[PDB]
From Swiss-Prot:
Residues of the full protein shown: 1380 to 1717 of 1761
Extra information: Its gene is located in the 5q region of the genome which is deleted in del(5q) interstitial deletion, a frequent deletion found in myeloid leukemias and myelodysplasias, suggesting that it may be a good candidate for the del(5q) tumor suppressor gene.
Stated consequence of mutating Y167C: In DIJOS; uncertain significance
Gene: KDM3B
Disorder cited: Diets-Jongmans syndrome: An autosomal dominant disorder characterized by varying degrees of intellectual disability, developmental delay, short stature, and characteristic facial features such as a wide mouth, a pointed chin, long ears and a low columella.
Native source species: Homo sapiens
Function text: Histone demethylase that specifically demethylates 'Lys-9' of histone H3, thereby playing a central role in histone code. Demethylation of Lys residue generates formaldehyde and succinate. May have tumor suppressor activity.
Transmembrane segments: none
Localisation: Nucleus
Protein name according to UniProt: Lysine-specific demethylase 3B
Notes concerning its domains: Leu-Xaa-Xaa-Leu-Leu (LXXLL) motifs are known to mediate the association with nuclear receptors.
Tissues expressing the protein: Ubiquitous. Highly expressed in placenta, skeletal muscle, kidney, heart and liver.
Amino acid sequence: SMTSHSWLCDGRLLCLHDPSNKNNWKIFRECWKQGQPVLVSGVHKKLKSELWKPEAFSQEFGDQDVDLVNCRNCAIISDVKVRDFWDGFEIICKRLRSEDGQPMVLKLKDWPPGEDFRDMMPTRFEDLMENLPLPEYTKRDGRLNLASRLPSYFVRPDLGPKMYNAYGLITAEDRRVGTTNLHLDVSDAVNVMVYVGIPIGEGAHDEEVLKTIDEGDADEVTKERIHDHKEKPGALWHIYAAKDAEKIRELLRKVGEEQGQENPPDHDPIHDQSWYLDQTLRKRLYEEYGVQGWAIVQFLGDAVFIPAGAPHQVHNLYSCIKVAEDFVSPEHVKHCFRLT
Ligand SMILES: N#CC[NH+]1CCN(c2cccc(Cl)c2)CC1
Ligand SMILES: [Cl-]
Ligand SMILES: [Cl-]
Ligand SMILES: [Cl-]
Ligand SMILES: [Cl-]
Ligand SMILES: [Mn+2]
């Protein structure tokens, strides 16, 4: 039977089922006030699927100049054409190769660039913004979005949205690498999975994905969602409460010193965006500092709500197109205030 919502993370994560239900705010606002992330499923069913395909981005925008990142070693591939990324998104025999002769796991950096999404892709901009869940929070002029209403005593988010495009991580060694390293944002955000590409040709990485989910600490109901085999999994997230950010900084200063890094006692390993918490580090955070997080598998059409100040990291299981919008809820406005 259709239902309004369910729970993941053993009851610690709200999952809303109908992205356009006018009563979602009643269930959402209690969890949100407590500093929890929230998941909303089904947004892909609201969108024009032909606007969110890799082949369309390559056809329309392929001659633009861009930089890529090699996810395995953080090397920058400078000043290549955006088609060199898009044409290898699903077809492994078309990917740029490292020296070792393997196909690379690449991230497309800052594309569309800065605040240019709306000007470059007006039809994509309209399709996303008209279908975002919790619209009183997430639309540029929603009644519960303070972004347009705050003085300069508050850090205001840039004009969005922002697209996040990267290949899936493949090997056993890749399990310890991030697509996006551990960081935090002073604004709230909603991140929507608009396309998942599951490859062919050398796309025999389905088996190692079914060991990542597990070691990633995903709950039994999420696992039930993986093992049912009805929906496409895109990315594994770990999110931590804003209140636990300093304890995470303490762990990462201890680990940096153990690994012979030479850092001042006050430096900020979360702002540096240089760490990915692997299974070893997540267990050390729990055992040594008493910190628990949320392990979230984002499927096609899932919207992840990330609270302001909450440290978070992202690991792509398959090739993903994500689109994110920043907003400033009244519940979390303290995180962007410039004093005390
Ligand atoms: N729409 C659709 C059909 N989908 C094909 C891909 N399926 C898949 C493939 C690899 C891993 C996991 Cl968990 C799921 C899900 C069903
Ligand atoms: Cl908070
Ligand atoms: Cl467009
Ligand atoms: Cl709303
Ligand atoms: Cl990163
Ligand atoms: Mn972020």
